[PDB]
Amino acid sequence: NRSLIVTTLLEEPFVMFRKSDRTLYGNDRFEGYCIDLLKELAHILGFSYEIRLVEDGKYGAQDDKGQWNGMVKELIDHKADLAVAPLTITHVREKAIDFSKPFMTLGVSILYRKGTPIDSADDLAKQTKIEYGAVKDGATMTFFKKSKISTFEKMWAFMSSKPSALVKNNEEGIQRTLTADYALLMESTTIEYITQRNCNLTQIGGLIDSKGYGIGTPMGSPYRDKITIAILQLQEEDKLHIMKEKWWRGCP
Amino acid sequence: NRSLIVTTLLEEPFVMFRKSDRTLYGNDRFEGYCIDLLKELAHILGFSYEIRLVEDGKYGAQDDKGQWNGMVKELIDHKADLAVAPLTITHVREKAIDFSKPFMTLGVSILYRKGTPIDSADDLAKQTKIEYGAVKDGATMTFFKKSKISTFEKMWAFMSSKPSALVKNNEEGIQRTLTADYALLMESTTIEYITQRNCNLTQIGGLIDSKGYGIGTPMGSPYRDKITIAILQLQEEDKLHIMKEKWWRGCP
Amino acid sequence: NRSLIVTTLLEEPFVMFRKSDRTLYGNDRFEGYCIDLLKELAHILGFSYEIRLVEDGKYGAQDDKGQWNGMVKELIDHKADLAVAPLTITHVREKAIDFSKPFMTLGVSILYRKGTPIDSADDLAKQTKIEYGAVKDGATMTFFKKSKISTFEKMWAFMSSKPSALVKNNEEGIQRTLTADYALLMESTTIEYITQRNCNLTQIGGLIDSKGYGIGTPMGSPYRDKITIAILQLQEEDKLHIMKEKWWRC
Amino acid sequence: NRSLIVTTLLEEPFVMFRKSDRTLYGNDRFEGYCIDLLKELAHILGFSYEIRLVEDGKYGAQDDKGQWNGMVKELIDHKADLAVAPLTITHVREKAIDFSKPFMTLGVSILYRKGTPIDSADDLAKQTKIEYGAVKDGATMTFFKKSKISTFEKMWAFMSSKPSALVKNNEEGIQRTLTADYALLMESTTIEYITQRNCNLTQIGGLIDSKGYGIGTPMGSPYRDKITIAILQLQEEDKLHIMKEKWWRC
Numbered sequence A, B: 001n002r003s004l005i006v007t008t009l010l011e012e013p014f015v016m017f018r019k020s021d022r023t024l025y026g027n028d029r030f031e032g033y034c035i036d037l038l039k040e041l042a043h044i045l046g047f048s049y050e051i052r053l054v055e056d057g058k059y060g061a062q063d064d065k066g067q068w069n070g071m072v073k074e075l076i077d078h079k080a081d082l083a084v085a086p087l088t089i090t091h092v093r094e095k096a097i098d099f100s101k102p103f104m105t106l107g108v109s110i111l112y113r114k115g116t117p118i119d120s121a122d123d124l125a126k127q128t129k130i131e132y133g134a135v136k137d138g139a140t141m142t143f144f145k146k147s148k149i150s151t152f153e154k155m156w157a158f159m160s161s162k163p164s165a166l167v168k169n170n171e172e173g174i175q176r177t178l179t180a181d182y183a184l185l186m187e188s189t190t191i192e193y194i195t196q197r198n199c200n201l202t203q204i205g206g207l208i209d210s211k212g213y214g215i216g217t218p219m220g221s222p223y224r225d226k227i228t229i230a231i232l233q234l235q236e237e238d239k240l241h242i243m244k245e246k247w248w249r250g251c252p
Numbered sequence C, D: 001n002r003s004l005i006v007t008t009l010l011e012e013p014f015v016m017f018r019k020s021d022r023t024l025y026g027n028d029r030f031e032g033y034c035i036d037l038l039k040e041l042a043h044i045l046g047f048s049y050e051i052r053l054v055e056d057g058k059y060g061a062q063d064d065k066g067q068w069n070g071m072v073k074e075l076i077d078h079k080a081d082l083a084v085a086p087l088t089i090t091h092v093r094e095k096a097i098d099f100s101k102p103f104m105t106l107g108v109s110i111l112y113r114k115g116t117p118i119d120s121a122d123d124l125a126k127q128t129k130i131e132y133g134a135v136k137d138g139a140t141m142t143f144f145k146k147s148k149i150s151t152f153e154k155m156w157a158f159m160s161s162k163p164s165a166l167v168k169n170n171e172e173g174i175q176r177t178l179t180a181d182y183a184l185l186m187e188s189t190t191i192e193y194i195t196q197r198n199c200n201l202t203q204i205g206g207l208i209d210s211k212g213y214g215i216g217t218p219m220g221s222p223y224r225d226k227i228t229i230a231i232l233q234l235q236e237e238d239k240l241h242i243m244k245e246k247w248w249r250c
C-alpha cells in the first residue's frame, strides 16, 4: 500500500548519473543496467518507488562488534525495502538480509595492465613488488578476510597490511591500477566492462570463485520471492540478456 | 575406449567452414560456437572425436509412419554418439533421444524487414498478403504443426498450404525474407545474429515460447550426464558467456 | 509449523484411491498425478500435510447470491491451506482465491463415440438430436454460462434447459457418453487420458479455449509465491513432463 | 529397481542415533547432516535405500598388502551402493572408488584446550611435552603417513611411535583432549562443531590443507554422475548452507 525505498550506489554501468543539459530531479537523475532492471521489476509486480544513494557509499561488511555498513546496513535497519545494485549474494550476508535469485553471474578475478609476467593470484601472493588490493567493505575484501585457503590468507595479510591497498570504490581502484604498480581484485563483469574500454588493461587469470548479483531485501520480506518470480519471467522473455548487451557492448 | 562420432550441420555462427588458402581436412574444416563448445567438452571429459555433417542437412522431425530424419535420426540409429549443434530441446524429441542441460536459451520469434505495420504473430495470422513459414523438419515447424492454440493452428494451416513457405534451411529463409514479402518464424539467437549484420531486417514481437539448445545423445547414453556436468562447469567458469560474445559481437 | 490441510477430490488420473488388500487410511489412501505433485511441493517447501476430500465433491462455482461452493469455498473459508487438484485458473476464481502459475495447460473440447459426422461444437449446436452437457459447478459449465459468443450462448440454453444435461462429475459424464447419445464438454488433458483407454471414444474438434491448472490458496496465503517457484523449478527439470507420462501412458 | 545399500558410520553431527522412548529400527534410527543429505539425494534421484553401519567402524585405509577396510572396502567389494558420510576425497581413495563432487569443504587442523601458547603444528612438533594423534585408518592419519614435508614427517614419527596416539574415532580423540595433555589432528568442520559446544576447547592454528567430502560409490557406478548433478543442484539452491546451519548451530 505504498511506494518502496530503493537503495543503491553509483557504479558504472549499473547505476550512473544521466547526461542532460537541464537539471533532472529524483529518480530521473539515474540511468544504467540496474535502473532498467528496476523499471522492469516495478512494472511486472506493479509497485512505485524512490531511489536513494547510500550515504557511506559502501556495499556492506561487518566490523568486530559485528555491525554492518553500506547498503546491507540500510536493509537491516529497514531504512530501505530493496537494494537494487550489483549486490553480491554471499552466505555471510544471507545471515543478515535476504536475496532474490541471481539476475547476473560473476566471479572474483584480477584487473592489471597487459604485457606483464603475472598470470594468477598465486603469482601476486609469491611476491611484494606489485601491490594489490580490493574495494573496501565489499564482498571481495570479505572473501579474502574470511578465507581459510593458504594463498588467500597470505594475500589478506598483505592487503590488510599496506595502508593504501583497500580502495574506496572501483573508480579509485581503476585509477590505482592505471597510475601505480597495482592489481585490483575485482568482480569479473566489471573487469569485462573496463577492459573493453581500456585496451591497456586486461583480466589476469580466471575466476577465483563463482557467484551472482541479487536484489537485496530485509530478512523475511515478501518482495523477495516476488522479485525472484519476476526475474525468472525476464529470463524467460530473454530480457536480461538484451539488457546486458545494451550496457556492455572494441580493442585490437 | 575410443573416439566419438559427432554429428552436426552447417549453420552460421554455430558451425561453419573455416577460411583457409590451403585445403583443410577432417575436423579442421570447421569453426564456430559449437566447434569451440565441442573442443571444451572433449577437453574436460577427455574424449576424442570426429565431426560428420548430417546427410539430409536436417535437424529432425517425424513423418506419419512416426519415423525421424535429420540429426535426431542419426542418434536413434546409433550412427552418432553426440549431436553438437544448435539442437532445440523439445518434449517431442525427448521421447526418442536424450539431451544434456541447455548450453543456450532461445525462443521462437519472427524475422521480417523493418518499417512495416506488422507487430506480432497474430498480425500475420489475420491476413494472407504477407507469406510466412519456417525451416522444414525443424523444431519451429513442429511447434506449429503440433500446436493446439487457435492462432498457431491457423498459421500452420497457412504455412502447410503454401507450397514454398517451408524452406530448406535458414540461409534460404533469410533469402526469401530479403527477396519476397515473407516473414520467417525463426529462433531468437539466430535472429539476433542476423539483425546485427543486416540493418534492414528486425525481430517482430517477442518470444512465442521459451526453450534451450542441448547436446543430443542416443537414449540411455552415459555421456548425457557427463556432458551436463561439463556444461555446468563451463557456466561456473563463465566460459559460455565469453563464447557467445565471441561469435555474436552494429546498426545505426 | 503445523500440517497444512490440502483439499482435493477424486478424479482420474489426478487423484485416485490406491489399490490394496486392506483398508488404507490418511494420506496413504491416495495416488495419482496431483498426489505426486503434492509430494514434490511438500519436499521442496518442507511442509507436512493432511489430505481431505471436499465434502460436496465440487470444484467450485457461485450461485445467484454470489456464494461459493466446492474446493474454492474451502479455501475462502480457510478450511484448507491448499487446493491440489486439476483446478482451472479463471478470472472469476482469481477474484476470490490465489493460484500458482499453471502446472498443466489444457482447453475445453468434446468427448463422444467414434464414427459419427459431428466434427465441432458447430455441428452439435446446429442440431438437437445428439444431447450434450458438462460437469455441474465446474469451470466448463461457467464458461458456457458466461459466454457472449453465439454458438455457446446457444449451448448454454440447451444445458440450462434439460434437467439431466449437467452431470455430477467426469465419471458420470463419461458413463453417459457410453450409455446414451450424449457428448461431454470436457477438458482436453482428461479427454486425452480417456480416449487412450476407451477405444470407442474420441475427441470431437479442437480446443474451444486455452487455460491452465494451478494450485489454489486462500487470498493472502504465505505459501502461494513459494509454490509458484517450486512449480517453475519442476518444469525446468522436466519433472512435470515425466509426471504426466507416468500417469497418462488404442 | 531394488533398494540401494548405504554404508555409513556414527559421527556427530553427520550421523547420530535419534532420541526416543522406544527402540527404533531401520533407517528411522538415524538423524544428522548426512541423513538429511541422503534424503535429498533419494528424493531427487528417486531411489529407496537401507542404511547399514560399517561393521569395523572405519572410514578406510590400506595395509601393507594394499588391501582396504572401512566404508571404502564396503564399496570396493560391492557390499554397498553408496557411502554417505563425511568421507574425505583423496587421490589414493580415488584410485579404488569414485566420489561425487564435494558437498562440504574442510582442512586438517588441531583441537586442544584453550589458554596455552601452542599456536600451530609448528609449536607442537618443536616439542614433545604435549602428546598428539589422529583417528586410526582415516584420511588425516594417511595424510601424515604419506607427507614428505618435514614438520609432518616429524609428527608421523611420533604417531607411528606411541601405541596410544591413534584413536579409534573422533569421540575417543575429543575425550582424550579433555582427559589428558593431548592435541587431536582433526578435520576443521568437525572442530567447528565441537568448539561451539565445548567452551574449554579451541582450534590451534589454521588449515594444514584443503579438501572436500564427497559421496562414495564403487567404480563403474551408474549413480555417481547423477549424484554429482544432485549435489550441484542442492548447492545452487543454498540447501547445503541451510543443512549445515541446521546441524552446526561459547
Ligand SMILES: N[C@@H](CCC(=O)O)C(=O)O
Binding pocket: A059, A060, A086, A087, A088, A135, A137, A138, A139, A140, A141, A185, A186, A187
Ligand atoms: N559487488 C560487490 C562490491 C565489489 C567488490 O567487492 O568487488 C559487493 O556487493 O560487495
Ligand SMILES: N[C@@H](CCC(=O)O)C(=O)O
Binding pocket: B059, B060, B086, B087, B088, B135, B137, B138, B139, B140, B141, B185, B186, B187
Ligand atoms: N534449432 C532448430 C532448427 C531451427 C528451427 O527449427 O527454427 C532445431 O533443432 O530443430
Ligand SMILES: N[C@@H](CCC(=O)O)C(=O)O
Binding pocket: C059, C060, C086, C087, C088, C134, C135, C137, C138, C139, C140, C141, C185, C186, C187
Ligand atoms: N477442472 C474443472 C472441472 C472440470 C470441467 O469443468 O470440465 C474445474 O476446475 O472446475
Ligand SMILES: N[C@@H](CCC(=O)O)C(=O)O
Binding pocket: D059, D060, D086, D087, D088, D134, D135, D137, D138, D139, D140, D141, D185, D186, D187
Ligand atoms: N573424514 C576422514 C576421517 C576423519 C579424519 O581422518 O580426521 C576420512 O574420511 O577418513
Ligand SMILES: [Cl-]
Binding pocket: C020
Ligand atoms: Cl500396501
Ligand SMILES: [Cl-]
Binding pocket: C051, C052, C053
Ligand atoms: Cl478425506
Ligand SMILES: [Cl-]
Binding pocket: D020
Ligand atoms: Cl518417535
Ligand SMILES: [Cl-]
Binding pocket: D051, D052, D053
Ligand atoms: Cl546397521
Ligand SMILES: [Zn+2]
Binding pocket: A090, A091, A094, D238, D241, D242
Ligand atoms: Zn547460503
Ligand SMILES: [Zn+2]
Binding pocket: A241, A245, B192, B248
Ligand atoms: Zn546476445
Ligand SMILES: [Zn+2]
Binding pocket: B090, B091, B094, C238, C241, C242
Ligand atoms: Zn520434457
Ligand SMILES: [Zn+2]
Binding pocket: A192, A248, B241, B245
Ligand atoms: Zn559479457
Ligand SMILES: [Zn+2]
Binding pocket: C040, C239, D043, D044
Ligand atoms: Zn522432485
Ligand SMILES: [Zn+2]
Binding pocket: C078
Ligand atoms: Zn486462516
Ligand SMILES: [Zn+2]
Binding pocket: C091, C095
Ligand atoms: Zn472482473
Ligand SMILES: [Zn+2]
Binding pocket: C043, C044, D040, D239
Ligand atoms: Zn530438497
